[model samples]
Target: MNIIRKMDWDSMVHEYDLDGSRLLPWEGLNTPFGGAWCIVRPETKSFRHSHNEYELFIVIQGNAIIRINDEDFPVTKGDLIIIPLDSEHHVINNNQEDFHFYTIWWDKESTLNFLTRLEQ
Candidate 1:
């Protein structure tokens, strides 16, 4: 177990690239391989992809819809969304400003195990 203090993070840009995403905190720090509060920017529409790890997205401030496999969930400030380990999702933010959300990512190994058995 590890404890990452808020003062240790550095604010950075969120890159929604083909491989995945680029995340940064207000304070510069890297804790473990996963699990940390990081800021995000919905610069553009993202895709629906699944990973081996569970992702918990707490919408601290934002306006958008989370598209699951077959449904769309409206999200805003004070709303929280979860993308299960093997579930596909995309962040659709068509707002003028950037959407702010906090994501605490988890280990990918467990997610890999689950995804291995799931058919694409």
Candidate 2:
């Protein structure tokens, strides 16, 4: 088991493209949840989408606008946002620099399991 893992930003393999942004999965973390490093370039926005799993985003650098369904929220470094399950959302970067954020996601089952543990 690995106790420490460093994120190599330069050599990260791009898993896929969401709209015009890059979605890079965080590998080797060995956990029940999933996460990724998302980069939204200047003047670009991610395509709006939703899923069953709840998502939580932590802005690591730069500033951006987060649109959750019909509401728009301006976000910056150190800001944390929780996206409710199945809620449409996207990020827009209008600044001159690239917007960077880390997203963590988990399904309902995981949520329930954690809650049950807390109740014990």
Candidate 3:
């Protein structure tokens, strides 16, 4: 297995809006191709998409409603949402404040195999 070091989440660059997203390095960093700290602009929505691997969103601030397939789940600060593999999902921030969250996804095959082995 690939090993990694622990570190704090801090910004070293200055930018705005969507470009402000920063990729973070974690233990399973390579599985998801590196996690992203994202800030979605106000009154905006994300494109609908599906992932072959598991996707997780840890909300840090603001409020938003997530469209997961046919259901709408409203989320706020300190919320953790999961987008299952191959499920179509999208996020919407209709408020004036920016919606910030950390996104992480894992490689389907490796993730399952690793978890299974670890649990055994």
Candidate 4:
């Protein structure tokens, strides 16, 4: 089994209409999880969206303001954010450089089931 996964920026495909954003293909990972790499361009923002799964984000580079629901939080390198399930979120990059971040999502029910199985 492959235990380590490498991220190749050049090989990632851009998401439709989502400028500077790319979704990391997780179909082959055999897990009930999905991820994406977002590069918010200077003075730009990402599209607002919400889903059934809970999302965890890590700021990999630069700085930006992440809006969750009606609130905004300033984020930078190494900042970790846990977004509530089904809450609307987006990022705004006001700096001259791009803001890079990675998001991992998993369904609530799937995670609960996984943990239940582990205890059995």
Pick the lDDT winner.
4
In the predicted model 3, the residue pairs found to clash are: none
TM-score of 3: 0.67
Off by more than 4 A, model 1: 1-11, 17-43, 108-120
Using lDDT, rank the candidates from best to worst: 4, 2, 3, 1
> What lDDT does the true structure give each of the candidates?
0.60, 0.76, 0.72, 0.77
Q: Model 1: how far is 92 from its true place, Å?
A: 0.6
List candidate 3 stretches off by more than 4 Å: 1-20, 24-33, 108-120
> Tens-digit lDDT track for model 4 on 13-32?
55522343334333334444
The segments of candidate 4 whose C-alpha lies over 4 angstroms from its true place after superposition are: 1-6, 16-28, 108-120
RMSD of 2: 4.9
Q: TM-score, each model?
A: 0.59, 0.73, 0.67, 0.73
Q: Score residue 24 of candidate 1 by CA lDDT.
A: 35
**So what's the TM-score on candidate 1?**
0.59
Q: What's the lDDT of the predicted structure labeled candidate 2?
A: 0.76
lDDT of 2 by residue, 2-111 (tens): 55556556665443333122232334333446677788878988877888988899999999999998999999999999998779998889999988888888887866
